[PDB]
Amino acid sequence: GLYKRPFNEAFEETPMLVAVLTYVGYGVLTLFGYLRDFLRYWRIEKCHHATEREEQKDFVSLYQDFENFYTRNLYMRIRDNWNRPICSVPGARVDIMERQSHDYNWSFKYTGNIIKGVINMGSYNYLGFARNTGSCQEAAAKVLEEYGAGVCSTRQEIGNLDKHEELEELVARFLGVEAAMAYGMGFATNSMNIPALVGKGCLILSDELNHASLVLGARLSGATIRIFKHNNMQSLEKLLKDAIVYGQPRTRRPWKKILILVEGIYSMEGSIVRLPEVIALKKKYKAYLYLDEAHSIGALGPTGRGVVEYFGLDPEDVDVMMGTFTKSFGASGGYIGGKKELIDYLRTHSHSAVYATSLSPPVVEQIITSMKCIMGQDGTSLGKECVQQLAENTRYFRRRLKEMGFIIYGNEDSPVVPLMLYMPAKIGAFGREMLKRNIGVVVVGFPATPIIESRARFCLSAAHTKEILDTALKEIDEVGDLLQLKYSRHRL
């Protein structure tokens, strides 16, 4: 495991007093949630919730009360920070339709006004291909005029077209691997091709923080699932040794296969995976590697070929390379790259290849045009400029925030910047105070992150010029002063 360039990442620890105050806040919310539920049960207070129809009251209750506890008493209070209905192209600036609630977020009414020119830090266009004008849009319009929107049958039967073959060969040339196959949903890609590779009698070693698609795909297959600590290579090595030695749990036979599920960039944490050590342990212990590159396929790398170019390694070492066109290339879809044996086996035994409708034609045209723009096949220098500008934006933004006194996670080269808030009231407060200042931020808490660590994730882009970053930094500094979000000991 050799790192040609330095690999420095900082996850500063939760303070003491902040953890104590987080716990006090969660306790207050829990007690008052119990009180509100008690008042709701005795019908002393009117409830703005739907109730099962009168002819089905004798049925077993569909939802158990405690199951939805956190949803009704905590999430519903700050629900206004999510599902914001934008009404324009999600470029560097997006138009958000204004909505207000008189029932304390139980029901939303859309006021007439639309908020214009909101700086967008929640959209995923890392390379800034989300535009309503350009070569990609005109090509998609041509394909829409000719082929039409949507295909009406599965790939195997009649739903395979020429555009799908063009996209698959283009992807195979892009990554550098021998062959690749394209699907209509990255979630579907994971959940429908992980069960094909492994089965009963195999071990799946998955990271602590994997996307729900990878966990669901592992669960659907019968393979035993063991979880190692997030980017802790000692734990991976110990698990590999114990798995190879002690064999299966009950009948201590050797494992048929051992598969390691890892991601390129973990969106919440922002940490890049230690790929060279993963490949070293893989080759040493004869395991197989599944690499989800949803977030790193267009961002990382001097020419944006992924994380394997970023580290400089060989794409042929990674066994299965998943990926998604939603983030960078600006069009929904997914893909899997590997050797031709793997691709043929998947083309035969993939659940979505057999039972699911294939991609749309305008979407594959947009993906093809974006890939040709990145690779320089178009002949113009848009592909080179976007990656350099994204790298400059990432370094500038991370430096400026870390020198203001905040706490930020992840490797210094990852575009996603999770700032940390740590308290349940500040999750709502930060979102509302940003939106009052014309910045859109994504705040995430308990359902997607550990309870104590509540964050505001920024997603940088090549669309953000330096003036937009300057304005966002000024307003984030003002709000951090307002809410006391500067928990950093080392820097100030």
Binding site: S153, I158, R347, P362
Partner: protein, 423 residues
């Protein structure tokens, strides 16, 4: 225990099985059809012009100029990509308009929009059904329903296809098991998962008795209307309108917008009490990007066209009647389907010992028909994974666009080819 030396030499011995088994080269699924141009009526498959009898386009809305114009307008407005989940700046206004249009069209309170047709019913079932519950799923249920049931950890009970005696038998046995232990029976929910018009058979489910069984035995019906959404009923609301059953008795109606509406996606409609749980516990909804705006606008325009003239359902019904009546008389094949079903099957009357020989006989029939300018397709299943694996069968799909003469010629072509090949 174990000394170190044998540990390293054990680690050295162990050799893993290859990732992918060597697939045989003579696999019919391996060779795909290369449909140049749009997969419309009078398509071009493998370089041969063929009238399209294989694409689930019942109303002929894929190539309609109004649909294309609406999709182009929305593409000019918003672009191709949404760039985020429905929770993080990924909810456009077209998504809300489409959800409201679906809810109004199906005469219900709420509807929810999924980005992929498989995921809608592979993610609706795991949200409501948890570990310990009981599901009485029909035997001939599509793969999406099977994977949805597997994703949840409930106890699956498969009854015979469209056989209410078997369902009532299972329900009574469950009543006895409930009376054995009441404390557990107080916290167990019972679901009946059925499909409105099965793809694996082409037959329609008897809702008049399913509703009565649900009301008598304290169950909850989950209906999948994918294939019957836009084809069945005077106004094309599904099987509930065909039977006249009230829309409230059925809890959750899940369908996909890919077949009749001709735009990728899926949707589940129901009362807000049932639907609002999916916005937070539906994995295909929370953890994936939203539907691209152009597809949503295409679906809205398709819904408009369905709402304007409801005669296309009648003409599709009469074309299904004509082709089903004409197909009676194949020497070597039998028709598996109904005079109302749009897409039905042609199976082998007398099956040989091996399934592969049946598959290759049907493939010979398909190829000979294709050379004669009629494009058919064979039903494709995952043999290793299906719980109830249907017999191999050619698939015949009907549509409002195919003329009467094309239907008669398709019947005659299939007759001659099947009599020759089966001889």
């Amino acid at each position: 225990d174990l000394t170190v030396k044998e540990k390293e030499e054990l680690i050295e011995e162990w050799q893993p099985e290859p990732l992918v088994p060597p697939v045989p080269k003579d696999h019919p699924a391996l060779n795909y059809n290369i449909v140049s141009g749009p997969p419309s009526h009078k398509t071009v498959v493998n370089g041969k012009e063929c009238i399209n009898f294989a694409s689930f386009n019942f109303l002929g809305l894929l190539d309609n100029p109004r649909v294309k114009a609406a999709a182009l307008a929305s593409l000019k407005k918003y672009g191709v990509g949404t760039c985020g989940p429905r929770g993080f700046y990924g909810t456009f206004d077209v998504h809300l308009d489409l959800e409201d249009r679906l809810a109004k069209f199906m005469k219900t309170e709420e509807a929810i929009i999924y980005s992929y047709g498989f995921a809608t019913i592979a993610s609706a079932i795991p949200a409501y059904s948890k570990r310990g519950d009981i599901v009485f799923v029909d035997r001939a249920a599509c793969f999406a329903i099977q994977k949805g049931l597997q994703a949840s950890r409930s106890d699956i009970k498969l009854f015979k296809h469209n056989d209410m005696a078997d369902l009532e038998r299972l329900l009574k046995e469950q009543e006895i098991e409930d009376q054995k232990n009441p404390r557990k029976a107080r916290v167990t929910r019972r679901f009946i998962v059925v499909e409105g018009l099965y793809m694996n058979t082409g037959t329609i489910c008897p809702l008049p008795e399913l509703v009565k069984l649900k009301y008598k035995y304290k169950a909850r019906i989950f209906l999948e209307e994918s294939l019957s959404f836009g084809v069945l009923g005077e106004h094309g609301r599904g099987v509930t309108e065909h039977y006249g059953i009230n829309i409230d008795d059925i809890d959750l109606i899940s369908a996909n917008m890919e077949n009749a509406l001709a735009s990728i996606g899926g949707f589940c409609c129901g009362r807000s009490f049932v639907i609002d749980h999916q916005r937070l516990s539906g994995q295909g909804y929370c953890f994936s990007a939203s539907l691209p705006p152009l597809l949503a606008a295409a679906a809205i325009e398709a819904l408009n066209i369905m709402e304007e003239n409801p005669g296309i359902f009648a003409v599709l019904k009469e074309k299904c009647g004509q082709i089903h009546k004409a197909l009676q008389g194949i020497s070597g094949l039998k028709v598996v389907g109904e005079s109302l079903s749009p897409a039905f099957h042609l199976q082998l009357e007398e099956s040989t010992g091996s399934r592969e020989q049946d598959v290759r006989l049907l493939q010979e029939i398909v190829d000979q028909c294709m050379n004669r300018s009629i494009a058919l397709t064979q039903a494709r299943y995952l043999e290793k994974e299906e719980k109830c694996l249907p017999p191999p069968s050619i698939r015949v799909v009907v549509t409002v666009e195919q003329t009467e003469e094309e239907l008669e010629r398709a019947a005659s072509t299939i007759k001659e080819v099947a009599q020759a090949v089966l001889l």
